């Protein structure tokens, strides 16, 4: 029951710009059944980096790519949920982390981050719509204006308006 | 929740830098430390790792792992080390000499042949003959660091070896 180990993007599937990349699909019952086969990677002529579940056609679509791969695009759909394997979503930062899209949602000192769509505890104007491509979803640490400290978030502690999250540099030698 | 973590049996982490924080508590099983780590409540930092002391039945939580500056692995028969995968780099630099993540599937989807096994392919790569290199479990690895990145022997008798499909850190934005 591994569905809680993927990063969920609602109302979304990915489209094969490229004719070259490949796909598996199976009609099924629940998105769980979909996690488990991506997690286990059985019966797949490729590495499962993401799956979509189609709540209307009850289908799973397992992918050897994700939303960040070249020659692939998101497509909208009320019936689609996308789930990307945390293993192929880069979990360190490059530079100041303008493009960090990992799922760490805790500040350096352990404070659970406050949702970008929320104004509680803290009022702010970093609307997700005002920052498209900067993936200000859920309560993830993000550095949307690409500032000095790397990814930060508003804090769910009313006494701490914000704080850096402590995410490692990919390469600093 | 004790599977979002990479387990090194028989291992713990000593801190040099005695300013890095640490919480410990006498708990009952290793699972009960995973959960407290995973939801990070009551720990004044970001839990990147924990150790379970099977003797003392104690847990030791850390805001660092075995790739952190200022900390050493250490053999201890009574310990087990569990590192949060968000903080083990999931991304390859160059040939992947130092790739220590948990991916175990080849690029065309075939499950990896464990290094501690000569079936179906026989080989010159035991763990302790190649120490420092983490030829642990069935993890995609690159011990001699050679052109196409981490690879493994393959559970499929027709395919001796194949590289895995681990992204470069340079792949994405
Ligand atoms: O201006 S707001 O309070 O709405 C957001 C403030 C966050 N910034 C503060 C300075 N660094 C944070 C790192 O300490 C960059 C982001």
UniProtKB/Swiss-Prot annotation, chain B:
Domain PAN: 1-86
Intrachain disulfide bonds: 33-59, 37-47, 91-169, 112-152, 140-164
Record domain Kringle: where: 91-169
Transmembrane segments: none
Domain of life: Eukaryota
Designated name of the protein: Hepatocyte growth factor alpha chain
Source organism: Homo sapiens (Human)
Residues of the full protein shown: 38 to 210 of 728
